[PDB]
Each structure stands twice: as C-alpha cells, then as structure tokens.
Design a protein around this ligand. Structure first.
Ligand SMILES: [Zn+2]
Ligand SMILES: [Zn+2]
Ligand SMILES: [Zn+2]
Lengths: 148, 167, 67, 123, 115, 295, 260, 82, 151, 51
C-alpha cells in the first residue's frame, strides 16, 4: 500500500503558545484508535482548521495506490491514480528525527517521529508499534482529510 | 569566573570559589608577593615592565599575551591566538622587552635598509656609513627597495626547468 | 529657474499652469484651491507648482549682452 | 557637487615625474594611483611577490644602472661604443648590469651626495 | 562619458540575433530562449502564457542584468511536446488575445462616444 | 600603531623547515602558532573530557564490555561475542580509557579554568555528522563497527597527523607537543564508547571519517612562505580601528594597546591583582587586614 | 493552453483621460499593456534643435530640452511617419520628421512670454497641443527687451523607452483586486487603510474575505494623456504595438526554428 | 643535502602552485611545447592548469632551507590540493 | 601586466579564496542588508510560494539541476516554502545547527526542542534547510555559520 | 615603499546585485584606457590580429 501510519485525530488545542505565524497554525491533537499525540503545522490560510475538529491523518511513503517509489520531483502532468485524490490537505516532507524512551539496555516502548514539510513541522509520538514505518531522512506525505 | 578561584572538586568537577581579591592603584609586585596570606602564585600585575623585572622574560611573554588579549577581547572581539603569540614572541625573543618603536625595532640587527624604511632614515643610514654596516638583503623591505623579488610567499623558492621531463 | 514643462514624476504638463497659478493666487485663492482649479490632483504635480521658485524673473532684472 | 564624471580616472603608461621617473599625481596630470605602504603590506601578507614587484618596480619606475663589481658604485656605461668603466677602480671589464627602480638609484645618489657609500655588491 | 545611447535598449546591433534557442542539457525537453533588446514587457507575458499550457513543466524568465538589454526565457515541456512549439503557441495565443482585446476596446470606445 | 606593528613583524615568515623566522634568520617560533597550523582552517570546538565529573567521565567514556544486553543493543552479534569473549580486546579498551584519563589530567593542567572551547583544525562532530548522513547511518540499529577497529584506526590516524617530521627523540617530543590538544580531542571524540552508543557509525563510515580527518588536518598545516608576521600585524591592527579611544578605572582600547606595544615605564593605571591564600580569601576581616598591610 | 478572452468596459472617456476595466486576462498581460502605455506607444516630439540666436537667460541646451518636452499632436501622423532609422533619406525628410520654426524678439518693455504658440510647424497636423484649437500655452522662455530667440527644430517618431518626452501618458493609474481578496498585500492594520475608488465593501468591512482559489482578474485603468494622442488612441496604439512586438518575435522565432 | 631524505612538506604550497602556474603559462605563451592534449584551449593559464592537473609541468621547485641547503621537488612529485 | 602576476592573483588573492579570514578563523564577508532582511522574512514558517513565483526564483539559481522540487503542500493548492527553495540554494550536503536571534533561551530545556514553536533553531541537513529562520547568525560573518561551513 | 603606478584606475563604487562576489563591473572607458600586453602565438594569432 505504501502507508506508514493511519489514524483519526481530534484537534484538542490550536497555538497553545500563541499565534507565532499568520498563515501557519500549530495543532495539538490526539487520536482515539491508537492514543498518539500529534503536533502539526498547517497552512490555515488555505486549509483552515478549527478547535475540536476531527480529521483522518495518513502518513504515507508514496501517493500512488500501487506500491511504487517516488522521485521527489514535481510532476503535475501525472495521470496515475494518486491517493491524494481522497484527501483535502496534503503535504510532503521528510523525517528528520526519531526519539524514544529507550534505555541503554531496553528498547523503546514509545517513539516520537519528527517530520518537516518544507519547514512546517510535525511530531507524531506514541507507541513504538505504530511508528515502525518511520526512518530518519525518509520522504513521506501527510494526506489529511477533515470529517464530520 | 576569570578572577574567581577555579578549583577541581574531589568529584572531578570544576567549581568556582567566590573569594576576596584586592586591586591596587599602584604596583609593587616585588613586595606584595612577599606578604603573609598573599598568594605568590596567582598575584600578578598589568605593568609588564615590573613583570619582566620580577619574574622574567617568559613571565612577561605570558603576561603580555594576557594583556593584549584583554585589550582585544574587552569589546567582545576575537583574534586568533597565533597572531597574539607571534606579536608577543617578536617583543620577547631577544631576552628583553623589545618595544614596537624605533627604540626597539631599529635597535635589532635587521639591516640598515629595513630600518631606514621604518623611522630615522638619515640617522640609520649615517650610522651604517660610519660603521660600514652591510645589509645582506634578507628582508622584504630591502628587496622591495632594490626592485628584487622579495623572499616572501611566491618568492621564497626558485623554479628550475626539468630537462628530463620536457621529452 | 523657470517652471518645468512636465511633472518629473508622471509627465503631466505643468508649463502652461504657472501664470494661471499666479493669477489665481492674486485672485485670493488658497494655494490648495488654486492647484485644484488647474487640475493638479496628484501630489507630484501639486509639488511641481507649489514648490517652484521663479528665478527667471530675477534673471530678467539684468540688461542683456546686446541692445 | 560630487559627480562621478569628475572623479573617474584611468592610466596606462602616461606621463612621469621629472625627479623620480614615476607616474604623475592627479587626474588633471593624467597621473597614476599611489600603491602605498599599506598596499605593500597587504600584498606582503598575501604573499604575492611578483605582483608586489610589478606594482613597486615594473609599473612605476623600471631602470638600469651599471655597477662596478669591485667598489659597488654606479659605473659609466657607453652602450653605443660598448665601453663600460669605473673611474674609481680604473677597471673597464668587471662591470655588471643591475635592474633597479629609478627611485632607488635616486636614493643612492642622494646618499652619495651626503658622503655615504651605498655599494651594491652583486656577489 | 559612459552613457549608452537610449536606443540600444530597443535596437538590435548588426549581426545580433533577436532570439537564440539553446538546448538545456540538465533536464530533457528544455530550452533557453535568449531574446535580445527585449525586457520584462514581453518576458512576463510570454512566461505567464506558457504557464497556462498544461504541457509546459517549467516556464520562467530573467533579465540577467538591468544594464544589459536581453532576457532569457527557460521553457521545459512534457516529452510529447516541444519548448519551441510551446513558445510559438504562447506567442500565437498572446497575439490572438491582444487582437480580441483591441477589437473589444474599439467597440467599447464606439459605444462610449455614441451612447 | 598599525605601521609600527607592520614594520616590526613584516619579514617574519614560515620557512620550509616549518619554523617561523625573521630576516636575520633568528627563530621566533619553532612552529607557527605553537602548532604549525594556518588560521583559516581552524575553528571552534569543545573538549568533551574537560568539564565532566569523574563519575560522568567514567560513564560516558569507559567502554562497558560487561553489560551483555547493552552491547547487544549497540553492536552486532559477532562483535558482541568477540568483545565479551576476547580479553586482548578488553585490555585494549581498558588502556584506551586510561589514556583518555591521562589526557583528561593534561587538559586540566592546560586549561585551569573549565573552558572547553578550543580552536582546532578539524570539526570532528561535523565530520561525524557528515559520515552519518553520507552512509545513511541508522541510530536505532546495532552497528557493525568493532571498537578495536576504532582504537586501532584512531592510533594510526594520530600517527599520520605530522606537524614535526623526524624519528629522532627530539622530533618525537615536538610532534607529541604540536598535536597534543588535537589528539586529545580526537581520542575523546572518536572514543570506542561514543562511536558505539552515540555516533553508531559503521566500518565504512569510520574509514571515511579517518580519511577525512587526515586530509583536512594536512590542509590546515601552515604553508612555507606565509608572511605570518605581516598577517599578524594586520590581524591585530584592523580590530584596533574599531575599539574605543576613550570598581576602579582601568585604561583600555587604543591607549592601553599603545602602552603595551611601546613599552611604557609609566602606565596610566598601573595595578596589581592580589589573591589571598587562607581564610583571608573567604572572610572579609582578614582580607581588610591584608588591605591595610598593603595600602 | 490557449489565449484569454478578455472583455472591456470603459467607465469614462474624456479628451484628457480614459478610465476602463479589462476582465478575464492575466496580470502579466495587464501589466505589459500598462508598460506599453508608457514606453512603447510612439508619438512625435522635438528631437533636434538648431539655435540660430539665443540672447535669453537660459542656455541653449536648456531651451532644447524644454522644446523636446512640449507635446505635439501625433494622432494620425505618427502611424504614417517613419523612424529616421528606417527612412531612406538624408538626415531629414517630411516622411520621417516634422519641421518647426521659432523666431521671437522682445522689443517692447513688458516681458515677452515665448510660449509653445510660437512653435510654427510646416505640418498643420503636428502642432503643439496647447496651440490646438482654456488651457494656456506652455512657456518656453521669458524674454526681456532686447533679448531674442530664433531656432529651428525637427520632431521625430519615438517612444518612452528612448526618452520620456516620447511618453504619451500623464499618469497611468493601474489597479486590481481593490478589496484585498487575493491578499497580495498584507495590511498590518487593515482598518487603517482608505478604500479604493473601485471597492465594493460596506464601511465596517476593511478588506474582502481571503479568496484561496482567486487569481488577478478585473484590472482597472485610468490612462491620462499628455496631449499628443487621445487616451483611447494611446490604448489602441499600445495594443497594436504589443501585438507587433509579438508578431516580430514570432517571425524571428520561426527563422530560428527552421534554421535549426 | 640527501635527496633520499627530503624534510620539506610533500604538498605543493599555495605560493608554489601560484608561481608554477604563472611560470608555465608564460612559457606556453612564449611558444613552449605543451605536455598535455588540448581540445580548444588557447589561454596559457588554462593550459598550465590542465598540465598541473595532469601532473605534466616540466618544472622543479628548489625549496631553500634556513640553514642554506635546498631540496629539489618535481611538480609531479608534490601533492596538488587545489 | 603579466601572466605570472595574473596567475599569482588568480591563485592567491581571488575573492572566493578570501572568504574566510585568518585573523579570526571565520568568514570576512557574509549576507548583507536587503538579502539578510529578506532571507529572514523568506525562511519564516508561513512563507508559501506559488508555482510561477517558484519558477521565477529558480531562474536565478546558477547551481540548479533543473528539477522542480516536490512542493511542501500539494493540496488544496501546490505551494513551495521559502525553506524549500533555500534548500536548493544551499550547496552540497552540508550540515549546520544555529539559532535565530529571537530564539528563547528556555526552549532548549523544555519540550519542543526539536520542533520549535517560533521556527528558531536553524537545522540544515544534507544541504536542506530542515527548519529555522536564517539571519545574521546563520549567514553572517560569525564562526560556524552556513557560509563558513560551506567554505 | 610606496609609489605611483601605471595601469591603475579609480572611480566611485556602485552596488550591483547581479555580479558574482568575485566580479567587478568596470566602465568601458577605463577598460578602453587600460591594456594588457598579450603575447602572440599560433593559438591566438587570429584573435589578436582581429583586435
Ligand atoms: Zn505629476
Ligand atoms: Zn669601481
Ligand atoms: Zn526621412
């Protein structure tokens, strides 16, 4: 499939530290199916998000419905079936950090994957079982859709 | 912390002890050092001449490096240490405090032409004439005056044609 | 020394407005109302008429070189 | 008043001063720009010895003198008849050609005016 | 002293080509059009018209130096298309747009003067 | 002041025997900057073994070859078995830690104030980061780098970084001194433990890192023919043009710089900094007693 | 992949300016039209002066520069005249130039205003705008008794790229998105800014709600004429000139493509 | 001095590179034979840099030591960094 | 006036060879007034460039491989970020950590150390500006800046 | 130690964002006044004859 992670999140706070940027807003959200915290930077100018909203987030390694790698190059004249068709807000970034609660001897029970979508930062932290698809310096997509 | 007493605790950490220090308006380093309850190891002065007279040439070398560093860095600036070290070695390599003046620079065996370039052109050349001094043309000033390639940078070596490799 | 022909900024002609401007000023117009009467609505052309110093009138106080 | 057209200036082998055969001073004199002591120090720091020699010897006042290999004093050369002789040493065979700045020749002559003997010894 | 004549911005020098096409080797199906004695007036419209072509992948222009009087327009198209063909179609479309705009402005002026 | 400095240092130059000498051929420095390195290539770094405590130093730099499961997390299976079974390797690592502890004491006497900021040729942390990204090092997986390979490679690297050339004992000691601080930084940065649980480099990454360190160090060496004297005069006179002309009042800026470079027998504000020995250093009454005995 | 279908709506047409709106066109097309109004709409202007006598207090270049900036009616003649580059004649001819003569002498005691009315042309169609059959005449120079100005000018065809004297506009107001809906501007305090004359907002509303899917359309123009051309002639000549620039570019493009 | 043991650096200094390139460029400009192949190069500096990259400059650098001796290094024997 | 002096200047005194000064082992030239105010504004988190703007800017990259990068935002509308274009400007695969001048001092202690609320804490990895607002501290003449690490 | 030199020029400096850091924008009059003595070879015989 090419999907590293999928869950439904609920916006629990927007800009706790205050609005830092005008067109960008930080959402602190939590899901229900996996109990994962999410910090996400979104361009609220084009995709406004209100407190208490509920959305489906899908971290993917590729947009093509069939398992097929991406070249990281912009190809607007691409007629393949892309899973971005099923979502409203889509970003493209790279994983730049994976933290955990590991010790010198024990493995990590909880992980924390950090992604940067051209400067818009995301932190998806929760159980390490749900974050095996994430590897540092790896390109991913956001694929986020609002639901009622 | 630059004037506090930095010790190493028994655990191995650096600890800055907050202790009394005295700052005088004159200098008698010779006497103050030899006083009871005065530290004869860290007590110093900013008068480099007294440091030279009391502690010697390497002590004044180090102290002069410290004072020049203090002058340079007080405005937050930073200069690579090799430049201060080279300046301080120039002033102390001959066993005495060589001022950067005619009284220190034109009193070393640098050659009359290098000296006339700096200061006291006529006095220097006249002294060299009276004493028959010979300039070996080792410095850059002497070669520059004679229009010759200074032994500096691209002039510090010679090039030869390689007859066996032109084939 | 003399009223410019065009406004330096837009290029509107102001050369034909200096005499009318002075005539309006002696007609007890304020400088703003005078500039409004001449149709100078952009503050660049108002700058041109309002800041002009007619030095040519002083240069014409000297007799020419030839009679 | 400071318009660029009254400041722009360039030189390439123009007139030279009479005393020291170096470029004149000023735009009005079609003079050359001064490569001063600080420029010399900068190029010494750069290590550019040939550029330094070009600026301070070859682009300013190249000159040649003939020196007696014995007394090191500037000899009398006659290149048309090829007769070189030092009146001091009374020799006419051990003379050498030396390429020096004209200002340095002028300096050495002004020192000889002061009874100083700057002897350019080529050995 | 150093002022170029004002016509040098508009007039071609003898033996100087109005437009030169050079293949861009970095990516396939890309070209550089170096147009002499033009400026942002044509560059901007040609670029923006080329951006309306879905077969154009890249369309940009630059005036490399304001004191110089040329523009460079880089055009990359899809493999089935050509940057020269894209540039030609962009100019054709701009010409047709301007012809239509001129006719409609004539009609609007006629209406305004008449009633 | 600038002209005076220049005329005083103008002919000091790095010679082809790597000594810094003046026109008279007298020796001003046996190696430029005491390390024979040019000032363009060096950069700010941190000595990692200077400030930490003995416990922290032990915990961060002593390779722990007893914890089987920790090694299992850091190293691959064959490396874990070789490290746990072999005693030659364990003695090699033990002597590595002893050598780092000796280096720690040497740094402690070099920097009596706990300032780990140092200026050294090669930015080893940046090179390690470069190796991590060039070879796509996964910090979460066990590494295939043998700690004995780290020890041996660092030792060979140290042998290849030569500022003073010669097999004679005097050249050996001068070589030891020229690269002492850098070799301490290198042994404390390329430590086997740090390379196992902090950087987690692979064998390929470590070999590339060793080569990169060697090449950049050889590039940082001063070039014979550098007019370091004119360069130093300029480096000290250029900042003088910005610093100002105008508890206690102390002369600073260009006036103090002048007083220093042209040896003044009558400084403007001559002063001492008297430091106290015993309880006088702590209490104020005895400090006042010494003050009265001085003033 | 094809052209726009722009529409036009002229909201004011006088002898002094034309105020119109172009809709359904790209911002680049609108700004190139705006630029051509200023820089590539040819007109006639004095570009050659021969001073036979000037006893006035302004030197010769002052008078020449001042004559160059007098607008000359260029409406139907500018299309017919050729550039002196293209004319196959000598320095001048009636096919590429228009001759003016000026000959004034202050004999009387009051100051004589040498104005644009004194510029006498050989061509009746190309005359100073103020001299056309109110607004006074442009003042060339004031003369004192005994001062005299006699010169002979030639006017040429050119556009504003070469010199601002060939610029036919006295201001080109250009605007789009009067309510900041595209947010191409970002007002720190939108309430502090006055409303555009083309705004359609109630006074409580400072700027329009942001339009994420919006593009610049509906460009508003106010082309004021210096006098040489009628404002609508400026706009029509601008469109024709831009179209001929593109046509020449396409011709040269075809030669370059076929030569490869 | 024993050529079997040369104490100077095995690297070409920046000043050695500068002067060798300038010297060889002047030699090429004065119609000296070129040691490398040439595609279309006509600038002597470019030809000299190509010869240095190819390690085919027929020049020997005589590095003088402070004691007065010297060491002769072929341009091909030195390590070219830049 | 000679090939030898020309080679001397070209190999010793050329400006790129002069970027780092031996005086203080740091760059001597950096990014300056308009380019520095603008790069600060450009690398803010809420700078989004459209396709035509991005192509306009890529026309002015000399060291561009001709590949348009995948925009940071694909939907509802393709938008590139200023960091995404500066990543194309940044050369090689250099790695650099800096901090914007407005970086709060108590942020590196608490949470959000690696996800900065203020977009401070510059991080360049593999020659991509992963995060942070560039300023004097990142592009000026100080030690360890991007221009220094690039050199 | 310092002297006047030939093949030098001086004028006011001006910004130019479109030059690289290692470039200097020179007027055509300074460049027409200043000259570089280029040696003739079969490599440059034609170009130098053109000049
Ligand atoms: Zn105006
Ligand atoms: Zn003799
Ligand atoms: Zn004609």
């Amino acid at each position: 499939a090419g999907i590293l992670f999928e869950d439904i999140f609920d916006v629990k706070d927007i800009d706790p530290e205050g609005k830092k940027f005008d067109r960008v807003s930080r959402l602190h959200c939590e899901s229900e199916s996996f109990k994962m915290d999410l910090i996400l930077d979104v361009n609220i100018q084009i995709y406004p998000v209100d407190l208490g909203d509920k959305f489906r987030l899908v971290i993917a390694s590729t947009l093509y419905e069939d398992g097929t790698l991406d070249d990281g190059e912009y190809n607007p004249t691409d007629d393949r079936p892309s899973r971005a068709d099923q979502f409203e807000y889509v970003m493209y970034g790279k994983v730049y950090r994976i933290e955990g609660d590991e010790t010198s001897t024990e493995a990590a029970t909880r992980l924390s994957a950090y992604v940067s979508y051209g400067g818009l930062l995301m932190r998806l932290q929760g159980d390490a079982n749900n974050l095996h698809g994430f590897e540092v310096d790896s390109r991913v997509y956001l694929l986020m859709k609002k639901l009622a | 912390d630059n004037k506090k007493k930095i010790i190493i605790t028994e655990d191995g950490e650096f600890k800055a002890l907050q202790e009394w220090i005295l700052e005088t308006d004159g200098v008698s380093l010779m006497r103050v050092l030899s006083e009871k309850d005065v530290d004869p190891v860290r007590t110093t002065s900013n008068d480099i001449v007294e440091i030279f007279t009391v502690l010697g040439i390497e002590a004044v070398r180090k102290a002069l490096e410290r004072e020049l560093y203090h002058v340079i860095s007080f405005d937050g600036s930073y200069v690579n240490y090799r430049h201060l070290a080279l300046l301080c070695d120039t002033m102390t390599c001959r066993g005495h405090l060589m001022a950067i003046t005619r009284h220190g620079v034109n009193r070393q065996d640098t050659g009359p032409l290098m000296k006339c370039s700096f200061e006291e052109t006529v006095d220097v050349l006249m002294e060299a004439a009276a004493h028959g001094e010979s300039d070996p043309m080792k410095g850059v000033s002497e070669n520059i005056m004679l229009g010759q390639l200074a032994p500096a940078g691209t002039g510090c070596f010679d090039l030869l044609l390689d007859a066996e490799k032109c084939k | 020394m003399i009223i410019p022909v065009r406004c330096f900024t837009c290029g509107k002609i102001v050369g034909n407005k200096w005499e009318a401007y002075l005539g309006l000023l002696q007609a007890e117009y304020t400088e703003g109302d005078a500039l409004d009467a001449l149709g100078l609505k952009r503050y660049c052309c108002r700058r041109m008429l309002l800041a002009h110093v007619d030095l040519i009138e002083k240069l014409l106080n000297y007799a020419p070189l030839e009679k | 008043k400071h318009m660029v057209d009254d400041k722009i200036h360039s030189r390439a082998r123009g007139p030279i001063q009479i005393l020291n055969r170096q470029p004149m001073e000023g735009r009005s004199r079609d003079g050359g720009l001064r490569f001063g002591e600080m420029e010399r120090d900068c190029q010494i720091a750069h290590g550019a010895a040939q550029f330094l020699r070009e600026r301070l010897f070859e682009a300013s006042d190249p000159y040649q003198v003939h020196v007696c290999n014995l007394c090191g004093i500037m000899a009398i050369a006659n290149t048309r008849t090829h007769t070189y002789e030092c009146r001091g040493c009374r020799n006419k065979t051990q003379i050498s050609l030396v390429r020096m700045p004209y200002a340095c020749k002028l300096l050495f002559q002004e020192l000889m005016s002061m009874s100083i003997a700057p002897r350019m010894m080529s050995v | 002293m150093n002022a170029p004549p004002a016509f040098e911005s508009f007039l071609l020098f003898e033996g100087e080509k109005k437009i030169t096409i050079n293949k861009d080797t970095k990516v396939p199906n890309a070209c550089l059009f170096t147009i002499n004695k033009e400026d942002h007036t044509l560059g901007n419209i040609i670029k923006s018209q080329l951006l309306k072509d879905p077969q154009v992948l890249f369309a940009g222009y630059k005036v490399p130096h304001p004191l110089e009087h040329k523009i460079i327009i880089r055009v990359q198209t899809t493999p089935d298309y050509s940057p020269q063909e894209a540039f030609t179609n962009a100019i054709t479309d701009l010409i047709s747009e301007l012809s239509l705009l001129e006719e409609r402005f004539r009609v609007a002026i006629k209406d305004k003067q008449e009633g | 002041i600038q002209r005076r400095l220049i005329k005083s240092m103008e002919s000091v130059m790095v010679k082809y025997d790597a000594t810094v000498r003046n026109s008279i051929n007298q020796v001003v420095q046996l190696r430029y900057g005491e390390d024979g390195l040019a000032g363009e290539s060096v950069e700010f770094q941190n000595l990692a073994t200077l400030k930490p405590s003995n416990k922290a130093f032990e915990k961060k730099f002593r390779f722990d070859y007893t914890n089987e499961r920790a090694l299992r997390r850091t190293l691959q299976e064959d490396l874990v078995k070789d490290v746990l079974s072999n005693a030659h390797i364990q003695n090699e690592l033990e002597r590595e830690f002893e050598r780092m502890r000796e280096d720690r004491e040497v740094l402690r006497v070099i920097f009596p104030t706990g300032d780990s900021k140092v200026v050294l040729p090669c930015n080893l942390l940046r090179m390690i980061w470069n190796a991590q990204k060039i070879f796509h090092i996964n910090p979460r997986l066990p590494s295939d780098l043998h700690p004995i390979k780290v020890v041996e490679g660092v030792k060979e690297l140290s042998k290849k970084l030569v500022i003073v050339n010669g097999d004679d004992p005097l050249s050996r000691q001068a070589q030891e001194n020229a690269t002492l601080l850098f070799n301490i930084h290198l042994r404390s940065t390329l430590c086997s433990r740090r390379m196992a649980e902090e950087f987690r480099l692979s064998g390929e990454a470590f070999d590339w890192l060793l080569g990169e360190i060697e090449s950049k160090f050889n590039q940082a060496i001063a070039h014979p023919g550098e007019m370091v004297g004119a360069l130093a005069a300029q480096s000290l006179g250029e900042p003088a043009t910005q610093m100002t002309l105008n508890a206690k009042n102390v002369t600073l800026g260009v006036p103090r710089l002048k007083e220093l470079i042209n040896i003044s027998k009558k400084p403007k504000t001559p002063s001492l900094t008297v430091f106290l020995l015993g309880q006088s250093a702590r209490d104020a009454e005895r400090a006042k007693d010494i003050l009265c005995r001085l003033e | 992949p094809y052209a726009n279908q722009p529409t036009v709506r002229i909201t004011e047409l006088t002898d002094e300016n034309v105020k119109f709106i172009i809709e359904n066109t790209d911002l680049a097309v609108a700004n190139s039209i705006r630029r051509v109004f200023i820089a590539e709409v040819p007109i006639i202007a004095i570009d050659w002066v021969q001073i036979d006598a000037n006893s006035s207090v302004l030197h010769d270049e002052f008078i020449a520069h001042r004559l160059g900036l007098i607008p000359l009616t260029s409406d139907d003649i500018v299309d017919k005249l050729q550039y002196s580059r293209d004319c196959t004649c000598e320095e001048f001819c009636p096919e590429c130039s228009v001759e003016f003569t000026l000959d004034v002498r202050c004999n009387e005691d009051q100051t004589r205003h040498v104005t644009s009315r004194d510029l006498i042309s050989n061509s009746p169609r190309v005359i100073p705008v103020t001299s056309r059959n109110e607004q006074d005449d442009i003042l060339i120079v004031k003369l004192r008794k005994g001062q005299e100005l006699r010169l002979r000018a030639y006017a040429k065809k050119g556009f504003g790229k070469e010199h601002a004297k060939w610029n036919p506009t006295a201001g080109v107001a250009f605007e789009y998105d009067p309510d900041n809906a595209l947010r191409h501007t970002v007002y720190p305090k939108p309430e502090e800014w006055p409303k555009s004359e083309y705004s359609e907002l109630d006074e409580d509303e400072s700027q329009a709600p942001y339009d994420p899917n919006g593009k610049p359309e509906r460009f508003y123009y106010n082309v004021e004429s210096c006098g040489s051309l009628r404002p609508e002639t400026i706009v029509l000549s601008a469109l024709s000139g831009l179209k001929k620039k593109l046509s020449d570019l396409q011709t040269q493009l075809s030669h370059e493509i076929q030569s490869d | 001095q024993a050529n079997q043991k040369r104490i100077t650096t095995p690297y070409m200094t920046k000043y050695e590179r500068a002067r060798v390139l300038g010297t060889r460029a002047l030699q090429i400009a004065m119609c000296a034979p070129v040691m490398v192949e040439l595609e279309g190069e006509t600038d002597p500096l470019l030809i000299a840099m190509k010869e240095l990259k190819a390690r085919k400059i027929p020049i020997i650098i005589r590095r003088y030591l402070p004691d007065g001796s010297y060491e002769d290094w072929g341009v091909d024997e030195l390590i070219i960094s830049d | 006036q000679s090939l030898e002096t020309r080679a001397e200047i070209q190999e010793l005194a050329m400006v790129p060879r002069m970027i780092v000064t031996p005086q203080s082992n740091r760059p001597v030239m950096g990014i300056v007034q308009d380019t520095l105010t603008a790069v600060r504004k450009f690398t803010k988190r809420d700078v989004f460039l459209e396709r035509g703007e991005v192509m306009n800017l890529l026309m002015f990259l000399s060291t561009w491989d001709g590949k348009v990068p995948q925009p940071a935002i694909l939907k509802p509308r393709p938008l590139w970020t200023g960091k995404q274009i500066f990543s194309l400007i940044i050369p090689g695969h250099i790695n650099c950590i800096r901090t914007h001048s407005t970086h709060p001092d108590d942020e590196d202690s608490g949470p959000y150390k690696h996800i900065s609320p203020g977009d401070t804490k510059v991080v360049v990895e593999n020659g991509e500006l992963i995060m942070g607002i560039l300023c004097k501290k990142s592009l000026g003449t100080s030690a360890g800046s991007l221009v220094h690490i690039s050199y | 130690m310092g002297k006047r030199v030939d093949f030098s020029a001086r004028t006011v400096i001006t910004p130019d964002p479109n030059l690289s850091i290692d470039q200097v924008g020179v007027p055509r009059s300074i460049a027409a006044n200043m000259t570089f003595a280029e040696i003739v070879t079969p490599f440059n015989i034609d170009r130098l004859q053109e000049l």
